[PDB]
Design a protein around this nucleic acid. Structure first.
Lengths: 144, 29, 129, 131, 217, 35, 150
RNA sequence: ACCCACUCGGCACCUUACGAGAAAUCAAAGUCUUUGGGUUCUGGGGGGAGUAUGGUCGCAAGGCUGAAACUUAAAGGAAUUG
RNA sequence: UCUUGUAAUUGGAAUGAGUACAAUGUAAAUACCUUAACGAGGAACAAUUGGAGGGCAAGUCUGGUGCCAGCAGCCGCGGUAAUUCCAGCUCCAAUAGCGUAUAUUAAAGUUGUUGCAGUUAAAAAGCUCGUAGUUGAACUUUGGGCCCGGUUGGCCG
């Protein structure tokens, strides 16, 4: 029984039945078509570097605020524009206009510690220094 | 209440309650 | 339709033992059914069995006696290289010491402990423990 | 185009890094032998697993197989001469029941402490590294 | 001082039965728990889970507490009990009563050869209760108990040392995971290994030969 | 509404019967000011 | 079950466990042979000959009394027909329902049963031209089978 | 024609669990972690979507075949309780 | 009467990171190995990276800022869709390493040959015929006797 051929000369069916059903996957189909090379903002890249255009007030609410707002950045290679995520306030004075930031994916989220929908690109470095070291007063960012 | 009808793609009668209310594709050589 | 008649007999034995029957009628009868049973009988898993001979294909009455946890057939009969005997018994036997998987070798139908003493192999036929 | 010098890792971190039973077990080992970091337990539990895995695949093999007889007696000789086994347990069925503390007992700083000369286990280590 | 109330209470009060092999070979139905306290000491007790469950009524709210307790001494004997009681204290007391009443022998074995005080299970064995399957595979020496912490505690209590434990299904349920493991090691003794193929001497079930002093007063 | 969620699931495991630590005034705070 | 329907009936005949000539018959062996070839000369069909012996002349079955089956007796004496027994009858049914079908245009059910009969002809024909009884094409077409039956 | 007994093949009905299931329930949904009698089809989280595009058959209405980008932490099913 | 922890209590030992005669090293050097001489009393010669509703290991911690048509009114308490607003203390893990991002593998029996599933949760073509494909009842030297030489355990040594 079990709904599939089982006899000893049925390897052609078992080989090509798997090939068609593998197309109903998600990691496999996204890999073979190479949609990382056709649609994603990152061209299959882990990081991307881009020019910041403007900073948004995507705020938690009106004045009584949990300040987590970030910028509108255009990637430099494919020319696509994405929305970024900066850490806690006090780093917005670092990021001016046209600073050429290096940004990476945000990815993991819980039901706390950052729940902003529509952003998946945290900013790692600004003007080629850092944001961890620049926030913790290790170095200084040159002005353009 | 009643148990609802179920299908993966919406039925033609149910689209009529909703809906009534080109560039061809390319394969890069 | 009745493709494999070894699957019929081994199913009829396992259905009969679990419900507590004392003997079961097996039909049809075969060389491979007879030679399967003789290995199971010689190892004490089943008791005495008698061949009823009408002219068509025979029938077998098997006197069960308990002491048979499971017997079954492996279809299709896979080509077992002699090094793959150890890999088989890990998959379909409860322990390492007891349990037998039955092979059709060129030296006759035999279990796996006997086959590795003779250093033969062949196609797998089924299992018993 | 010179030949690539082969290298391999000698330790393996555990898959479940946070269990209160094992975290207290390894810390007990570290204090009583004076171990600098948990890699030292990781390293022993790596090569112990290699010895048990090699001897386990020999035990699936039948008796009197010369591959089992040659490799098995080689493995018994190597562990007894180091000192992990005793002279009365020279069989393959006993090397499966080895323990991590058996290997740590055969170290240098553990052995120099057992021979006097140290007065504490941490003094044994710091004496050795000062040549 | 325990007062015997059933027939089997008279069996253990005179001390004519001492070992558990005779009572378990015929598998006598046991109703009371007090005969094991007076016969087998050293039962290590561990409470596993306590939770409150509620019952909604017309006006008020009636609550109770469900407790699971696994009991074994150190070796080959284990019992698991299910009990809902009105208070947390009585759930422990009545939980142990039904757990010790559900005691069953555990049949151990060897991974390899048969030498030196068996450490593991004999056969591959499983247990299922409501989409929770627990499988137990024998392991060689030094392998430890690679199991869930509740099942590892259950297997530490039963008396095994070397067990592989692969599991399937949505095993987040704790009350189903324990009894699936309990029936698996309960199924091990139900399995018939060919070492027991020799015929038993057919004991006379000595309940009848001692019924003269075990009848009503 | 992070504090509302953290309390809501916490007495649920009273009824499920598992250990959970008793609380104080750090329950709904960012434990780490970020990068 | 059946080849072309959902029936599962097991009506059959049971040959006895006696492979040899029961005692009360004791008539002859050659006399049924001249009886067989006499009935075949009348123009009968090898099933009709076998059923008429045991209804009348007490021949239990011609396989055991003579030693050969009825087909091999007729083929030895050269009375065999062109196409075999059953393949002839399948065409004779298929012709009659087809003659019926052209008379009744709107018989959708006869149209379905004709597909079933014609399918049962092809499976039988592929067997016979495999064992080299018919010519190795034999080409059953609809029109010429009307001539093949009469 | 009716009654009794048996048998073959049917449409179903009631009780039960040796078993099976998440449960309702099931003589099959049984003989499956102790997993292999033969063989066809279909499915792989929800929206976007039976949409776009191409091919095909249809007088037409339409039917058949049939995606992806993007977005989302759901989407469900079984039984009872206030 | 014999064993541990604590201290802005105390004492001398030991050593290499360094500097460096020399020598080894090297085509010549640098570096390693050896070594005359100098080289430790803590802000010396000062270890970081992450984490604390569960995972999961680690708080009945502290201070400050802003709001409350909430109680009380010398103080305070509580909330705060401030998704804690800003800092600190404590604790845990790994350790000259540690974190993040993307890809892939295990977990995974969510690709299922081993090893999934299709009544009600995704999924049995409306139904039947039918070519390739896959699969296909039982059956023909079974048994008995003879000796021969082997590899394993032993009663034996």
């Amino acid at each position: 029984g079990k709904g599939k051929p089982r006899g000893l000369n049925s390897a052609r069916k078992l080989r090509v039945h798997r090939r068609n059903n593998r197309w109903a996957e998600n990691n496999y189909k996204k890999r073979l078509l190479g949609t990382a090379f056709k649609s994603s903002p990152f061209g299959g890249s882990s990081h991307a570097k881009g020019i910041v255009l403007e900073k948004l007030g995507i705020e938690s609410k009106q004045p009584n605020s949990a300040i987590r707002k970030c910028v509108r950045v255009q990637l430099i290679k494919n020319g696509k524009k994405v929305t970024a995520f900066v850490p806690n306030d006090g780093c917005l004075n670092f990021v001016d206009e046209n600073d050429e930031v290096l940004l990476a994916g945000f990815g993991r989220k819980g039901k706390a510690k950052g729940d902003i929908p529509g952003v998946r690109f945290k900013v790692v470095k600004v003007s080629g220094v850092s944001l961890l070291a620049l926030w913790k007063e290790k170095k200084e960012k040159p002005r353009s | 209440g009643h148990k609802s009808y179920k299908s993966k793609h919406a039925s033609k009668g149910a689209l009529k309650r909703l809906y009534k209310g080109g560039k061809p594709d390319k394969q890069v050589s | 339709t009745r493709s494999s008649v070894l699957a019929d007999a081994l199913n009829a034995i396992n259905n009969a033992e679990k419900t507590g029957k004392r003997q079961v009628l097996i039909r049809p009868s075969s060389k491979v059914i007879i030679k399967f049973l003789q290995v199971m009988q010689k190892h004490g898993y089943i008791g005495e069995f008698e061949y009823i001979d009408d002219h068509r294909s025979g029938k077998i009455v098997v006197q069960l006696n308990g002491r048979l946890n499971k017997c079954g057939v492996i279809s299709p009969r896979f080509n077992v290289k002699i090094g793959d005997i150890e890999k088989w018994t890990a998959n379909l036997l409860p322990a390492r010491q007891f349990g037998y998987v039955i092979l059709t070798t060129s030296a006759g139908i035999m279990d796996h402990e006997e086959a590795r003493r003779k250093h033969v192999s062949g196609k797998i036929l089924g299992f018993v423990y | 185009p010179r030949a690539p010098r082969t290298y391999s890792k000698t330790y393996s971190t555990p898959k479940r890094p946070y269990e209160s039973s094992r975290l207290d077990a390894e810390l007990k080992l570290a204090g009583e032998f004076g171990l600098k970091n948990k890699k030292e337990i990781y390293r022993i539990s790596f090569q112990l697993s290699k010895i048990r895995r090699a001897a386990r695949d020999l035990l699936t093999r039948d008796e009197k197989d010369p591959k089992r007889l040659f490799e098995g007696n080689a493995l018994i000789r190597r562990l007894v001469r180091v000192g992990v086994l005793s002279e009365d347990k020279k069989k393959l069925d006993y090397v499966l029941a080895l323990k991590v503390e058996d290997f740590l007992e055969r170290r240098l700083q553990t052995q120099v402490y057992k021979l006097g000369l140290a007065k504490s286990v941490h003094h044994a280590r710091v004496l050795i590294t000062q040549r | 001082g325990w007062v015997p109330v059933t027939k089997l209470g008279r069996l253990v009060k005179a001390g004519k039965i001492t070992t558990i092999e005779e009572i378990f070979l015929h598998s006598l139905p046991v109703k009371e728990f007090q005969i094991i306290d007076t016969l087998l000491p050293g039962l290590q007790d561990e409470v596993m889970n306590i939770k409150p469950v509620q019952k909604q009524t017309r006006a008020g709210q009636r609550t109770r507490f469900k407790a699971v307790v696994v009991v074994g001494d150190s070796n080959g004997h284990v019992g698991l009990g299910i009990k809902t009681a009105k208070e947390v204290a009585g759930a422990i007391r009545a939980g142990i009563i039904i757990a010790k009443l559900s005691v069953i022998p555990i049949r151990r074995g060897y991974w390899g050869t048969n030498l030196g005080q068996p450490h593991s299970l004999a056969t591959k064995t499983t247990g299922k209760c409501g989409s929770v399957t627990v499988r137990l595979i024998p392991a060689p020496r030094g392998s430890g108990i690679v199991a869930s912490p509740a099942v590892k505690k259950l297997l530490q209590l039963a008396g095994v040392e070397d067990v592989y434990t692969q599991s399937n299904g949505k095993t987040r349920t704790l009350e189903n995971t324990l009894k699936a493991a309990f029936v698996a090691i309960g199924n091990t003794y139900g399995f018939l290994t060919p070492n027991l193929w020799a015929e038993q001497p057919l004991p006379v079930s000595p309940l009848d030969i001692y019924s003269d002093e075990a009848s009503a007063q | 509404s992070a504090k509302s969620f953290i309390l809501r699931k916490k007495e649920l495991m009273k009824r499920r019967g598992r250990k959970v630590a008793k609380d104080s005034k750090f329950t709904g705070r960012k434990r780490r000011h970020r990068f | 079950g059946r080849m072309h329907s959902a029936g599962k009936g097991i009506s059959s005949s049971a040959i006895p466990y006696s492979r040899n000539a029961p005692a009360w018959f004791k008539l002859s062996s050659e006399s049924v042979i001249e009886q067989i070839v006499k009935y075949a000369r009348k123009g009968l069909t090898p099933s009709q000959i076998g059923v008429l012996l045991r209804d009348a002349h007490g021949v239990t079955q011609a396989r055991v009394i003579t030693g050969n089956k009825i087909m091999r007796i007729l083929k030895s004496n050269g009375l065999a027909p062109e196409i075999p027994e059953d393949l002839y009858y399948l065409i004779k049914k298929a012709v009659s329902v087809r003659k019926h079908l052209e008379r009744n245009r709107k018989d959708k059910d006869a149209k379905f049963r004709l597909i079933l009969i014609e399918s049962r002809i092809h499976r039988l024909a592929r067997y016979y031209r495999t064992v080299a009884v018919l010519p190795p094409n034999w080409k059953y077409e609809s029109a010429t089978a009307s001539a093949l039956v009469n």
